[PDB]
Structure formats: structure tokens, C-alpha cells
Design a protein around this ligand. Structure first.
Ligand SMILES: NC(=O)c1ccc[n+]([C@@H]2O[C@H](COP(=O)([O-])OP(=O)(O)OC[C@H]3O[C@@H](n4cnc5c(N)ncnc54)[C@H](OP(=O)(O)O)[C@@H]3O)[C@@H](O)[C@H]2O)c1
Ligand SMILES: CCc1nc(N)nc(N)c1OCCCOc1ncccc1N1CCC(C(F)(F)F)CC1
Ligand SMILES: [Cl-]
Length: 163
């Protein structure tokens, strides 16, 4: 059972300049709660983007997807494909794919749940941005209310399940 979890601007941006181009503490808390104790699968660029204090993510089984043979990711398990990441030698009840755009596209056919934070931030996409997946008609969801962050941004959470 594989879920994707991401935060996106309403315009669909998830990443810029090797990071996330807004600050949304309530999203960090949401992400922390959903993933603690579970497996988190990420692309190598997302692994390299992590803040020092969260590389690896504490209290979670970190898995990093790369084409590099012999890459070492201290504190994580390195695998060579998303399929390998979803075939662990030690099964986990809950596996979360935590980005980025390349790994989400590989993961979406294998997933049955998406947890999406939508951020009302004016971010006209730029040419090198990482963009969110778009969920087609095989997905249906439920939306929480629009809330205001202590940071000032409006945001809301969506939960999708494969039909
Ligand atoms: N807003 C959010 O929720 C969120 C979440 C996560 C990340 N982000 C942002 O998104 C950006 C990073 O995303 P990204 O799309 O650029 O990168 P990414 O998906 O995190 O990682 C890409 C890397 O994954 C590996 N990879 C990709 N396809 C593969 C395949 N078929 N087999 C094996 N390895 C494969 C490659 O690593 P190698 O080059 O090592 O071979 C590739 O360079 C950053 O800006 C980050 O801050 C945002
Ligand atoms: C939070 C950002 C986030 N939101 C949702 N809803 N889905 C995600 N897939 C996601 O991206 C997680 C991987 C990238 O993560 C970060 N990128 C930049 C800055 C900070 C982080 N975080 C902070 C929390 C930290 C902790 F370990 F505490 F969880 C992990 C690193
Ligand atoms: Cl944490």
C-alpha cells in the first residue's frame, strides 16, 4: 500500500532552486504526523534538498532512488528503481513517496492514496520548476476547509484515493 504526499502551490509548483518556495509550518506538521514511524521513499535530488537536521528524516525508514551505482546516502537505504523501493526485504505496513516530481511520476501508477497540501501562494511557474502530478479521473478525493497559516498563507489539505 503506497501513498504519495506533496505540497503544491495552486499553480502546481512543488520545487524551485533545489527547495520548496514557500514556508508553511502547518504543512510540515501535517507531513511529520502522517509519516512518522513509516517508510519514506524519495528521489536522489529530494534527498540532497533536505535540511541538515532532517537528512535522514528521523524516526522513519529513509529510502533513496538513484541511478548511481555505489552512491552512499548515510542514514538511508539506496535503491536503483522505484519498484525496488516498493519491494523492501523487510515489509512496512505504510510506505509514503515524499518526492520529488520525477519520483512522483514513477510512483503514481503504483499508488492508491495521495495526500496533497494546496498552498494559495502566487507563484507563476518558472522554466526549471518541479511541478506536481495531476490526478486524472481514476482518483477521487475529499477537501478540508481553507485555513490560514500562522505564517499568513491560505492552505488546505486534500485526501485522494484511487477509484
Ligand atoms: N513540495 C513538496 O511536497 C516537495 C516534495 C519533495 C521535493 N520537493 C522539491 O522538488 C525538487 C526535487 O524534485 P525533482 O523532480 O527535481 O527530483 P527527485 O524526483 O527528487 O529526484 C530525481 C532523481 O531521482 C533519480 N531517479 C529518477 N528517475 C529514476 C529512475 N527511473 N530510476 C532510478 N533513479 C531515478 C535520479 O537520481 P540520480 O541523478 O542520482 O541518478 C534523479 O536525478 C526540489 O526542488 C525539492 O525541494 C518538493
Ligand atoms: C515538508 C515538505 C513536504 N510537505 C508535504 N506535504 N509533502 C512532502 N512530500 C514534503 O516534502 C518532504 C520532503 C522535502 O522536505 C523538506 N523540504 C524542504 C524543507 C523542509 C523539508 N522537510 C521538513 C520536515 C522534515 C521532517 F523530517 F520533519 F519531516 C523533512 C524535511
Ligand atoms: Cl519529525
Amino acid at each position: 500500500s503506497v501513498g504519495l504526499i506533496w505540497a503544491q502551490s495552486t499553480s502546481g509548483v512543488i520545487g524551485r532552486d533545489g527547495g520548496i518556495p514557500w514556508r508553511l509550518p502547518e504543512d510540515l506538521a501535517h507531513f511529520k504526523r502522517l509519516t512518522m514511524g513509516h517508510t519514506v521513499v524519495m528521489g536522489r535530488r529530494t534527498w540532497d534538498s533536505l535540511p541538515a537536521a532532517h537528512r535522514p528524516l528521523p524516526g522513519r525508514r529513509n529510502v533513496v532512488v538513484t541511478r548511481q551505482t555505489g552512491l552512499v546516502a548515510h542514514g538511508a537505504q539506496v535503491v536503483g528503481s522505484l519498484e525496488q523501493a516498493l519491494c523492501p526485504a523487510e515489509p512496512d505496513a505504510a510506505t509514503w513517496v515524499i518526492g520529488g516530481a520525477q519520483i512522483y511520476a514513477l510512483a503514481l501508477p503504483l499508488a492508491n492514496r495521495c495526500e496533497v497540501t494546496e498552498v494559495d501562494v502566487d507563484l507563476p511557474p518558472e522554466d526549471e520548476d518541479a511541478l506536481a502530478p495531476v490526478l486524472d479521473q481514476t482518483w477521487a478525493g475529499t477537501s478540508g476547509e481553507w485555513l490560514v497559516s500562522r505564517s499568513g498563507l491560505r492552505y488546505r489539505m486534500h485526501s485522494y484515493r484511487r477509484l
